[PDB]
């Protein structure tokens, strides 16, 4: 039975071909479905202006707000009030924070260097400064970070990501180790899972991962803002392969935005959760004499679903608007094909299911009864061919 082979496959191909015209007038109405259409287009729009104009609802804002946050927190365990190296004139120099020498004895045995020049920590200190500044205004307690539009707070975000840009470059460039035993936190560094190591601090999970979140955030920061351009040059029809071409374009950008938030979030998430404990609550390191990460961390996991959920959505619809003319071609490519091979299946003494006109395209005397594309398969002779399919198992 080279017969029934033969059968088999034929079957197997033209029920193919039915769920595929099936699958295909579904993205053909979506794109000839003109609220649907502008739905997705207002909500892609909407979506750009809250992420270019908001201080609050900005998903790629929130990011930056987190990151920076996130860098300064590492900087206070590293440094801030309490200094996990020993900073020295080129001995020991008069700067705030610096610890007792003892520290370098008890702390810094073997063969890693935990001092620093005075010179290279000053421009440290600086630039956290300035990041800090960037990020709040001091007296005022209120954010200084303008939205990714501009300044009409001071501080644009791109400056504040170039400021941790730097900071974290210099960080990991200088080759001071840092003794974790220096940090205290009560409830943190006197427990089990506290972190008493001293390294550089390139061999720290939690600096290389909050490192990385810098470059990430300035392409979205990029891509964000020629997505305010790309907008204004659509809008909504009443009703162009000019617009098939951009819609979709439009989708994807929207949908690599919150990508980029989530690859934030992802390298939020893989800190080793005994440094994460640290970073949570380098706020309250204590020296020798608010702020809170996990809720805009959240924030980053919640814009993510939010937003990011029905920017998939308007991305499936634009690229049911960008293959239109693709489908069109394809659908009747596949209708003749279904059909031809429909009649050579006919022809076969030893078929057994009938497929005569199994699809169609209902006629009115002079046009199309319901659209060009609005193929009918049978139910009856489809079910039959399924069934067919499933005893031939």
Known sequence: ????????????????????????????????????????????????????????????????????????????????????????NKKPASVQGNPPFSTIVQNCSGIENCAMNQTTY??????????????????????????????????????????????????ANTKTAMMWKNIVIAGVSNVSGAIDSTDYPTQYAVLNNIKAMIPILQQAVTLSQSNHTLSASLQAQATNPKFAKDIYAFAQNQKQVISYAQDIFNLFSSIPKDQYRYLEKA??????????????????????????????????????????????????????????????????PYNQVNTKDIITLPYDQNAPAAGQYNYQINPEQQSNLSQALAAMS
């Open 1 to 88: 039975t080279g017969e029934l082979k033969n059968l088999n496959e034929k079957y197997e191909q033209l029920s193919q071909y039915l769920n595929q015209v099936a699958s295909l007038k579904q993205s053909i109405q979506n794109a000839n479905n003109i609220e649907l259409v502008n739905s997705s287009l207002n909500y892609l729009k909407s979506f750009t202006n809250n992420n270019y104009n908001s201080t609050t609802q900005s998903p790629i804002f929130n990011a930056v707000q987190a990151v920076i946050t996130s860098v300064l927190g590492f900087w206070s365990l590293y440094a801030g009030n309490y200094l996990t190296f020993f900073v020295v």
């Open 122 to 171: 000053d421009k440290m200190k600086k630039l956290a400064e300035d990041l800090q500044a960037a990020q709040q205004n001091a007296t005022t307690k209120a954010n200084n970070l303008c939205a990714l539009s501009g300044c009409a707070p001071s501080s644009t975000v791109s400056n504040a990501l170039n400021l941790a840009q730097q900071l974290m470059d210099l960080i």
């Open 283 to 348: 706020y309250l390191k204590i020296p020798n004499a608010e702020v809170n990460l996990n809720q805009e961390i959240q924030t980053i996991q919640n814009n993510v679903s939010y937003y990011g959920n029905r920017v998939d959505a308007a991305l499936s619809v634009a690229k049911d608007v960008y293959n239109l003319k693709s489908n069109q071609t394809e659908i009747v490519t596949t209708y003749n094909n279904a059909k031809n091979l429909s009649q050579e299946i006919s022809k076969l």
